[PDB]
Amino acid sequence: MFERIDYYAGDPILGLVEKFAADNNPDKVNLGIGIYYDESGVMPVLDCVKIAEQRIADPISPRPYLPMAGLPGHRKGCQELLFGKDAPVLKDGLVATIATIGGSGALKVGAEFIHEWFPQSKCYVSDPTWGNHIAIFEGCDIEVGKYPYYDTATGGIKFDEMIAFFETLNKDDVLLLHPCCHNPTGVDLTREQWDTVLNVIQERELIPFMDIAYQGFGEDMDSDAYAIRKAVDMGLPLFVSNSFSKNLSLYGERVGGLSVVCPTVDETERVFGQLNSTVRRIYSSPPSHGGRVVDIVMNDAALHEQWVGEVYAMRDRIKSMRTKLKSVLEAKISGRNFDYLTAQNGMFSFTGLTPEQVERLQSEFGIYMISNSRMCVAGLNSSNIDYVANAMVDVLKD
Amino acid sequence: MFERIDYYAGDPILGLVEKFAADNNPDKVNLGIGIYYDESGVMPVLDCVKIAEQRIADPISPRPYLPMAGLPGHRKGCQELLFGKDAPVLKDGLVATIATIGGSGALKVGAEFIHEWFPQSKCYVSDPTWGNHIAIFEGCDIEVGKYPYYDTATGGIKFDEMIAFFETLNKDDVLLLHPCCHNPTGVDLTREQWDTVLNVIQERELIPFMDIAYQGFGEDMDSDAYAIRKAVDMGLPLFVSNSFSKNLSLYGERVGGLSVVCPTVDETERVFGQLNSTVRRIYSSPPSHGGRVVDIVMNDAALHEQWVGEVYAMRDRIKSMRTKLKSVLEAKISGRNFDYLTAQNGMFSFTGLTPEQVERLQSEFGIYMISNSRMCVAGLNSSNIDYVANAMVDVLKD
Ligand SMILES: Cc1ncc(COP(=O)(O)O)c(C=O)c1O
Ligand SMILES: *Cc1c(COP(=O)(O)O)cnc(C)c1O
Ligand SMILES: O=C(O)[C@@H](O)Cc1ccccc1
Ligand SMILES: O=C(O)[C@@H](O)Cc1ccccc1
Ligand SMILES: [Mg+2]
């Protein structure tokens, strides 16, 4: 009966974590997953969240269906965070926003909308990009190519080729952009660079789709959303898929939003409708618990202030781990320059190791990174940072 | 830019519920949505759930991603409920199970898997069925038809006619079947009738997709799964989408499951694999809270036992309401037989009122039913029972 059914290779990341989890090396460290850990190496329960969740259990309440859009609190929360507290675009009401099943869910609802209403639109992702970016869009029958982003030699963006690619693209083609914290490279666009990408986007009449999963981990909430707030002011139409998984440390509850920026208030009334429609045929409505935590935190002034604070802290620890790594490498290896490590943003570092080098850190050390060299800086703490840095030196000297 | 986008109308049930909210009428009653309400007309928090949630709140824990297939306890939870604890089929390891974003999430993943691997398969739903059933399958670009089911003149099933229709479908065509508690009519197949349906399905080699959203509201957990369990013995390739929304009274948390019964261990691995692949490409992972509630309630024997009793309570309450409705209507109306009301099962009832008659109930009484006559019996309690039946009498008398 199910002879035709093909085996799954697994999520390429989770294929690695599986190898790690069923490997019993004493010294093993996992730096191959986009999860934030603290100094003890454990996943933090944020204080603001802990408060949100105690409000929820006091008392345990009946659990009706959330609106398909999710709770308005969630919906406002996303908007004020992405665009600005009482921002002009929001004042206008030119942004359609739903709660989604994390960032993933937001991209899916977004992607489906695009497949249906713009069948002729192709989608383009960075070279390289996150794995699920391609899978989600292709899963909608969207044809997916890649724009050149990362330059192997410099270790920065291949900007000249990139803008040139964008010229060769048709009206309504979809550009899957990372406003900050590039996954997996860590190499972000400069604020001047964004203005160049966007002005081409306005001219070439293209569609910008922005995937911001790590707001508050680049520079800060407001700075990280620069690409978002600019495109808006340029009057451009734009899709914004946001995630609270990392910055809220709530991966499990599947919290996130999709926001769509429209020329008109009426056009927004239409888009919002089709978003609910798209949700209806997928999962019907977002989960209550997750929705409530977002609502509580984003809308409680004190809790919100407290939240921005703890994200600042997480960001800072990462920035700090980037420094210590650069320190130990520059000290023990006189030859190469490792400024890219502290130049890169958010949770990821393309450590610029060859696929053979990444292999070596795995066999002898129990140090896991992706074949393309991506490393989650958040996997590093005082207690293990020493070991990893030396191992990288040893693999670099080889 | 989005001028190609047409307005959504809204979910028709939600349009009816919305209409109910804005009603002036002091005595308005909502019988239009398939939510269980207790003898007071409030959504209940199950005691077993209260206990689970407080276990989750003590202490509040880190929130890592659930496996794509959800927690193993949630899966074991589902499998045991549907197929029966220590089912041969479960012992053989021949069911691929994932946690899903409610029943809707199970239907979606299910449909998407079918669209992928059986592109020529068409899907047939019962006439009539739950509105949202079509949306999901059409939402996958699967062509959807209607197999004859409910007979209007008799108020039963056009069974003879149905079986012949099934003889006319192609290999691997998909039948969406309500094992019990048919939404929206409440008219169910007898155990005999089910053997014939499954025999044809076997012979024509059709795919039976069972959507069970009300397990324990028909007769009981075992009886309601009879179609599921018979299907299994016959060696049929079964798809079961189970919702916990209603029986676990946890709609908001989006708890359900999807299970695929396979000939071999290897086919189960391939299918399990692809089920993950599908989940990854949609939303990545199911929500942590709802999953944990399910895991806790199902796999704690004292809680499982308590849960089951609390469902049967709800079942028994619905049942008394049917009895009382029949009683009152038979008292004040002659030339009609009201045994169909007690002949039906679960939360829904095709009450046999004309579209105009439903219209009069809303207009003067604020009694809200679907135009096709579906009534959620679970919106009836001793406080409104007399009011509703009398209103039904008035509308029927003329
Ligand atoms: C680059 C990127 N974008 C978006 C997401 C959204 O995923 P989630 O469902 O956890 O929000 C992720 C998650 O890892 C990601 O890595
Ligand atoms: C409610 C329901 C489902 C599942 O809907 P969810 O809210 O996602 O759990 C499936 N089938 C029927 C007939 C239903 O009434
Ligand atoms: O970029 C990363 O490394 C994470 O997105 C990986 C991941 C996402 C979702 C689920 C499991 C794993
Ligand atoms: O059949 C019904 O109407 C409800 O049981 C389920 C539902 C109602 C409204 C919206 C979504 C889902
Ligand atoms: Mg499709």
Author numbering:
A (entry chain B), B (entry chain A): 1 to 398
What does the paper behind this entry write?
The psychrophilic aromatic aminotransferase from Psychrobacter sp. PsyArAT exhibits an activity typical for ArAT: transamination, which is a transfer of an amine group between aromatic α-amino acids and α-ketoacids. B6 is discussed based on crystal structures of complexes with four hydroxy-analogs of substrates: phenylalanine, tyrosine, tryptophan and aspartic acid. These competitive inhibitors are bound in the active center of PsyArAT but do not undergo transamination reaction, which makes them an outstanding tool for examination of the enzyme catalytic center.
In either case, carboxyl group of FOH creates two parallel hydrogen bonds with the guanidine group of Arg374 (3.2 Å and 3.0 Å in monomer A, 2.3 Å and 2.8 Å in monomer B), one with a side-chain nitrogen of Asn183 (3.2 Å for both monomers) and one with an indole ring nitrogen of Trp130 (3.4 Å for both pockets). Interactions between the ligand carboxyl group and the cofactor was present only in pocket B, where it had contact with formyl oxygen (3.1 Å). The interaction with the peptide bond nitrogen of Gly34 was made by the carboxyl oxygen of FOH (2.8 Å) in the active site of pocket B, while the ligand in the neighboring subunit made contact with the same residue, using its hydroxyl group (3.4 Å). In pocket B, the -OH of the ligand made the second contact with Trp130 (3.3 Å) and created two hydrogen bonds with a PLP molecule, first with the aldehyde group (2.3 Å) and the second with the hydroxyl oxygen of the cofactor (3.1 Å). In the active pocket of monomer B, Arg280* made an even shorter bond with the OH group of Tyr8 (2.8 Å), but the interaction with Asn132 (2.9 Å) replaced the one with Asp11.
